[PDB]
Design an enzyme around this catalytic site. Structure first.
Site, PDB file in Angstrom:
ATOM      1  N   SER A  51       0.870  -1.232   0.101  1.00 11.76           N
ATOM      2  CA  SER A  51      -0.067   0.024  -0.088  1.00 11.76           C
ATOM      3  C   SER A  51       0.916   1.260   0.024  1.00 11.76           C
ATOM      4  O   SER A  51       0.341   2.366   0.027  1.00 11.76           O
ATOM      5  CB  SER A  51      -0.771   0.145   1.175  1.00 11.76           C
ATOM      6  OG  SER A  51      -1.844  -0.720   0.991  1.00 11.76           O
ATOM      7  N   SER A  56       1.247  -3.469   3.548  1.00  8.62           N
ATOM      8  CA  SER A  56       1.374  -4.807   4.257  1.00  8.62           C
ATOM      9  C   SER A  56       0.983  -5.661   3.073  1.00  8.62           C
ATOM     10  O   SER A  56       0.060  -5.602   2.353  1.00  8.62           O
ATOM     11  CB  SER A  56       0.588  -5.069   5.585  1.00  8.62           C
ATOM     12  OG  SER A  56      -0.623  -4.898   5.418  1.00  8.62           O
TER      13      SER A  56
END
Ligand code: NA
Length: 260
Positions: free
Chosen positions: A43, A210
């Site tokens: 992200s 993540s």
């Protein structure tokens, strides 16, 4: 260097692979650890997409106020903010803030669509001189984080330089840069990552990420009091596909960097 031995020790203790890039803008000096190795961005790529839309807004002055419909079919695997607006609308400013501050994947996909696909995000990176960043997939699959897979990767050095240009430099218009800085400072997902390894009196703006292989990332701009700002990228990934998150490694890397 002493910092590099301590980062190598942290990496050995961790069982995974650590990538760090620090830019000290007081003298444009750099500390790198695996700085030219590829890592899955996860992200943290949302920063490039938000910045690319901000760039468009330099010509389309009202672009950030444009409403975008959120349809039930738009909702993907993690949509904490966009789900609150299903069968309604969010502006591109609101989608940018949701993507950045909550890591909302539906919001990210709306930014990608505004840019004409993942190639539109990569295009913006190329336009500002980042030849390393590549975004290949949309938000539900870009964080598989498979070892050796070039998709959706960058290097710590490249992302540190790009983040510096976007927030402290002039890759964006001054107002757009200021908006991005504000969004990053308002991130809600970073308390256990770079921020946790830094003095509590330093101001931080960051974006985490993540993914698979226990991939745990954070990219930050850091404003110490009475000292020039820093840019810090900390990327971390692990050998096992099912590995758990290790935000502590990012905090520990930040602490080592700050003590050096
Ligand atoms: Na995976």
């Amino acid at each position: 260097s002493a910092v590099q031995q301590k980062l190598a020790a942290l990496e050995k203790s961790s069982g995974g692979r650590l990538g760090v890039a620090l830019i000290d803008t007081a003298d444009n000096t750099q500390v790198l650890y695996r700085g030219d190795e590829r890592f899955p961005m996860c992200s943290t790529s949302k920063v490039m997409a938000a910045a690319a839309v901000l760039k468009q807004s330099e010509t389309q002055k009202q672009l950030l106020n444009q409403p975008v419909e959120i349809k039930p079919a738009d909702l993907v695997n993690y949509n904490p903010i966009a789900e609150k607006h299903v069968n309604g609308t969010m502006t591109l400013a609101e989608l940018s803030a949701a993507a950045l501050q909550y890591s909302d994947n539906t919001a990210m996909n709306k930014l990608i669509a505004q840019l004409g696909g993942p190639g539109g995000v990569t295009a913006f990176a190329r336009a500002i001189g980042d030849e390393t960043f590549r975004l290949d997939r949309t938000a539900s699959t870009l964080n598989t984080a498979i070892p050796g897979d070039p998709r959706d990767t960058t290097t710590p050095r490249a992302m540190a330089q790009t983040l510096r240009q976007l927030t402290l430099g002039h890759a964006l218009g001054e107002t757009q840069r200021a908006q991005l800085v504000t969004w990053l400072k308002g991130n809600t997902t970073g308390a256990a990552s770079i921020r946790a390894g830094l003095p509590t009196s330093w101001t931080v703006g960051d974006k985490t990420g993540s993914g698979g292989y226990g991939t745990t990332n954070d990219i930050a701009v850091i404003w110490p009091q009475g000292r020039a700002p820093l840019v810090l990228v900390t990327y971390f990934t692990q050998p096992q596909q099912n590995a758990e998150s290790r935000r502590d490694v990012l905090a520990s890397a930040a602490r080592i960097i700050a003590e050096g």
